[PDB]
Amino acid sequence: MGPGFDFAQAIMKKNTVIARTEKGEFTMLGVYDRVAVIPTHASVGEIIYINDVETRVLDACALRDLTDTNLEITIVKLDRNQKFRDIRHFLPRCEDDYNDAVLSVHTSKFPNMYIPVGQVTNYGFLNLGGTPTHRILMYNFPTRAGQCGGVVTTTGKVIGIHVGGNGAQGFAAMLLHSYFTD
Ligand SMILES: NS(=O)(=O)c1ccc2ncsc2c1
Numbered sequence: 001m002g003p004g005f006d007f008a009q010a011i012m013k014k015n016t017v018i019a020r021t022e023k024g025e026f027t028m029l030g031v032y033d034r035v036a037v038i039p040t041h042a043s044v045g046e047i048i049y050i051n052d053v054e055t056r057v058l059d060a061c062a063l064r065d066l067t068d069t070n071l072e073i074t075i076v077k078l079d080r081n082q083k084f085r086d087i088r089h090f091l092p093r094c095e096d097d098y099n100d101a102v103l104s105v106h107t108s109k110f111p112n113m114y115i116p117v118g119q120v121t122n123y124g125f126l127n128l129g130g131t132p133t134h135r136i137l138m139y140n141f142p143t144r145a146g147q148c149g150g151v152v153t154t155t156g157k158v159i160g161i162h163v164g165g166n167g168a169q170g171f172a173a174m175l176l177h178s179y180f181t182d
Helices: 002-016
Strands: 018-022 024-031 035-039 046-050 054-065 072-078 096-105 114-129 129-139 151-154 156-165 170-174
Touching: 002 018, 002 024, 002 054, 002 096, 002 114, 002 151, 018 035, 018 096, 024 156, 035 156, 046 072, 096 129, 096 156, 114 151, 114 156, 129 156
Parallel strands: 072 129
Antiparallel strands: 018 024, 018 046, 024 035, 035 072, 046 054, 054 072, 096 114, 096 151, 114 129, 129 170, 151 156, 156 170
């Protein structure tokens, strides 16, 4: 309906797939080549399903910062026969706050779902299901089950992936350009 949903849609239509692990279905964001991200609580193994295709996991890394604290991002390299459109130029380089964010989800249940979550705060520390976690973004939408992996964008930037909620707020792990240098 506006430039926010326009950018969100462009990212969803080319750079997402439906990942399925032993812990169910997830919005998975493809970043470049065969490299994608998913919440660490997805518990990626040796094998994953991508758009309902048995796919070997060539590598999987659950990111932590240099304080040895969880970031709740798992970077996955997929044994896929096709490369993602490279979107690393849409990743912010620094931790920051944002206005007018959209949280975008695509599953079998929730296809083509776009939520205007509004103002985003650099929240920082969060105790996420008992795990100390850093670089958390917070927004004031009562998000729900099946929205995890959801992509958070602003007009111009892909800023994080949805990793949880407390019924009043939602929380995203930051995506930083430095995570995907090669
Ligand atoms: N993205 S936008 O805000 O410029 C916009 C608004 C209304 C509209 N109606 C049809 S196409 C279209 C685009």
